[PDB]
Amino acid sequence: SKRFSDIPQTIDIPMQDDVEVEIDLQVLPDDPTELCSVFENEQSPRIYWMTVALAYAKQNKIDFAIEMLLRGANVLQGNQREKLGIITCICWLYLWKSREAPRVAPDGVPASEAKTKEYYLQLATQSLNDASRINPAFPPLFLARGVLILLKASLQPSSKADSNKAEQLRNALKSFEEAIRVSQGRNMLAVMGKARALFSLGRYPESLAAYQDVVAKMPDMVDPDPRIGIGCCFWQLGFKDDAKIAWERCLEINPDSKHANILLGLYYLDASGHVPTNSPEFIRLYKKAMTEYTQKSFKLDKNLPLTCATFAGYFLSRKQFGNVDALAHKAIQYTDVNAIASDGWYLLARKEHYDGNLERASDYYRRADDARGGAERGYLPAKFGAAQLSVLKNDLGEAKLRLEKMIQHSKNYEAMILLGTLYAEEVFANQSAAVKEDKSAEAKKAISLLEGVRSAWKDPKRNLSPDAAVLLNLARLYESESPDKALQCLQQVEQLEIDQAIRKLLPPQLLNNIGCFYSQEGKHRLATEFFQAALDSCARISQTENDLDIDALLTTIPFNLGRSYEYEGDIDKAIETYEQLLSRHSDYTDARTRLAYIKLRRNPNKEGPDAVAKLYQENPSDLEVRGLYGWFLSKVNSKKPEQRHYKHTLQSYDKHDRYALVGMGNLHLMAAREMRRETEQDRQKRSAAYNRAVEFFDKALQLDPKNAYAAQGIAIALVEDRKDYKNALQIFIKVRETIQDAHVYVNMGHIYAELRQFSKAIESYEIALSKEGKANDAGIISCLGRTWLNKGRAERNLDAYKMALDQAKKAVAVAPDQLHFKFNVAFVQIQIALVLHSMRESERNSFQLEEAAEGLEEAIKILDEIAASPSPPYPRHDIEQRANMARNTQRKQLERALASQREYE
Amino acid sequence: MIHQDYIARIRYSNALPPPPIPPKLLDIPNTGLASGQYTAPGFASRLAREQPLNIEADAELGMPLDLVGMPGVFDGDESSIQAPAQPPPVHPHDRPLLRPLSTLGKP
Amino acid sequence: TLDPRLAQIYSGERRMGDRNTALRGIKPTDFSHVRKLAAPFV
């Protein structure tokens, strides 16, 4: 029946004398020590000892009851039949005391005389052993074994990666199963114990089956209610709504069930998780769960760990910390369960984190992690709190440790974003350091991490909150080598900024950079509009509160705008903007450097060289300005040691100025093809000069393997010093896809001309001529003409001689003064005459022969004039010799033209 | 003499571009780690909530088994903690709790 | 030879190309194998 219904109100103690002592078992003595003495001195029988002890238990005075039964035990040592009884009761009472005990007592414990759980457990073990030595196989002792083993098993700390606990659970199970066997399966506490063990073994369906069996066989067993077990089993197994049903039924039966209340609050808490953030539905569910069910349960027991932890979390959310400490502390002290301990430490950690006592916060996080077994298992949020706590204190190495450790465990979003940010910032810091370390690996790691974060924004299942900061960092990471991704990033940062045709005045820096990325692409007006938009945006900030260095941005951005105009073309406006920026701020030198270049192209003769000189003088140590001046000196050499001199003075200003080095390889190279070869010693001398050119080319290209100009200069070195066309051509092919300058194509055409690959040398040259700067470059037209001519020789192709003449005539049009160009049209005409004379009538036409004769006349004229001309390309007598053979070629062509049009009859 | 041919001086050039001096990137103000947002507890509060709840109150799981007070057990009889010979009719509110796991559907 | 004001104005600036980066061309490429063949040159 009901527990304690057994006890009567009053009883009479049979004294040695009589009638004697009567006792009220509802309102007992405040101390039983005397009564114990009475019973000792009365050799008192054993029912009285038990009746009074259990009486003390009914009004919660459990120790009294223990003490009584301790003395009763020793008083009846001769007889073991009820000794067995009281010793078993002792054991069970030691389990009770065990339950209300603490894991550990305060630091002034003292550790011996520890009132701890393990103290009562060990005491229960001994008493139990005493009773089993009397009668092993007394059913209540089979129960006792089970229970004990459970209570001891729960105290096993979390293992890493347990076998100790698992086996202990098995032992409990077998003891509970023995208690069942002995009862022939009618002991419901034994089967409840078995169910518990199964649940601890993760055998949930059998555990459920067991609690259900209890309810089925014995519904009125409600102390303890197995329906709790039912609910817990349902919840694991993933049926939290049926768990709800069970625990509501638990409460229906007993609304003051302190565990059913918590469990129901936990149901609603979980439910409040599945609904969003703060909402009407969320708030009702959360206040319901916490206030109703957890408070209710807390009023019933202030010392109930799960409740304590849960309500500590409640207060945490409401930033009310005196409560949080007390509760969470209480929970940690009084718990059989590690999970609870870890949750308590975690709550305290988050409190001390908020308030800022980081050392004890980090220790707390650590204890929270370890409670669940620490590393390789543990509490993910606790680990994270540690990582953050280590990030502060600036001990960023260890932060890197644990975050890595975590992402290796699982792709946790919060780890990924923090680690990636950490790496990004490492790279950014590096770049302004005294010595740039190599952090390309750390950069990659960052990029990958924040792209993994982008994946997190992508997948519908997560709730998908987006961060600016991540996008900006990622934009900067990509900036150096993968700029288009950086652009896209900044475009989506644009969108996020605007959300919170198109007129856009967002912060200036964002707009500028976007402008910059647009500018690296062709979109120079899009860029220009973005710069203008940035300026406007700075003006808007200027009027209002926020102080940014608006004067700095109003120096930088208008340069960018001038540069963009310049890119775009309305250079005059570029000029005026540079100038306006200069009027307000004339010491911003990059502006005037662009001005001087704008000038160098507009007025090559006059103001430009004036302007650059002035800029070199007024501003002689700016490496960009320098480069420009050197570029200017190169133009003067083309016009032809001022340039080499200067480049290595600059070389004393900076050892690794790639521009100047390739400037040297170039200068050497040019000066050294014209070096008198003579032969022998003289010939060697210049091959040393090429060596020096390659000296400079290689150092330059070793600093910057991406440098195409240095590599191409090595290909030129190749071709000229060691006629290695084949690989020099390799260099040329992949420099060609990166450079696009005319001279690249010219140099290519030169190689292909050598390699008999005429067609491909043709349209190399053709592409060169297409290109801005002169289409009509005489020297390229010449080279193209001869290439065509050699193609005509090779292939027996008239049309190729046709083209060679056409080209030779295009050149003559351009420079009609020029002696040789005239010789060339002439030579080619004589060749066409020749080849046409060699051909068979079967493959020839009479029209062709007329035009050839015409051309030949032209040729004789040109050659004849050249003979008379001073400074002839070849000796004049050799030119006359060519003309004299042109008299008998005249007749060859006469003859065969007659023969041909007769064939044409 | 007859070694005359098309005349086209043949030279290679590697002229450098003038320093472009492109536009200049500006530093976009951002929330660092030093700015507390990423190191604040708050940022972890979502991550903390989506963690599964522990529903294990005790070693005994909130159903504490003690025989203490149970009328005869320390003497011979487990009557108090023994199921009746005749199973009682099932209460309507226990019917849903008695449903076999199979009957429950899919998790 | 920077004025203090200029020096801090430049502080905010980050270059995205210069003399040297220009020589890498419109799309960078590795030319260290060319380094290999400059080597036997000298």
TrEMBL record, chain A:
<dbReference type="GO" id="GO:0006368">
    <property type="term" value="P:transcription elongation by RNA polymerase II"/>
</dbReference>
<dbReference type="GO" id="GO:0000993">
    <property type="term" value="F:RNA polymerase II complex binding"/>
</dbReference>
<keyword id="KW-0802">TPR repeat</keyword>
<feature type="repeat" description="TPR">
    <location>
        <begin position="555"/>
        <end position="588"/>
    </location>
</feature>
<dbReference type="GO" id="GO:0006355">
    <property type="term" value="P:regulation of DNA-templated transcription"/>
</dbReference>
<dbReference type="GO" id="GO:0016593">
    <property type="term" value="C:Cdc73/Paf1 complex"/>
</dbReference>
<keyword id="KW-0677">Repeat</keyword>
<feature type="repeat" description="TPR">
    <location>
        <begin position="785"/>
        <end position="818"/>
    </location>
</feature>
<protein>
    <recommendedName>
        <fullName>Tetratricopeptide repeat protein 1</fullName>
    </recommendedName>
</protein>
<feature type="repeat" description="TPR">
    <location>
        <begin position="742"/>
        <end position="775"/>
    </location>
</feature>
TrEMBL record, chain B:
<protein>
    <recommendedName>
        <fullName>Paf1-domain-containing protein</fullName>
    </recommendedName>
</protein>
<comment type="similarity">
    <text>Belongs to the PAF1 family.</text>
</comment>
From TrEMBL, chain C:
<protein>
    <recommendedName>
        <fullName>Cell division control protein 73 C-terminal domain-containing protein</fullName>
    </recommendedName>
</protein>
<comment type="similarity">
    <text>Belongs to the CDC73 family.</text>
</comment>
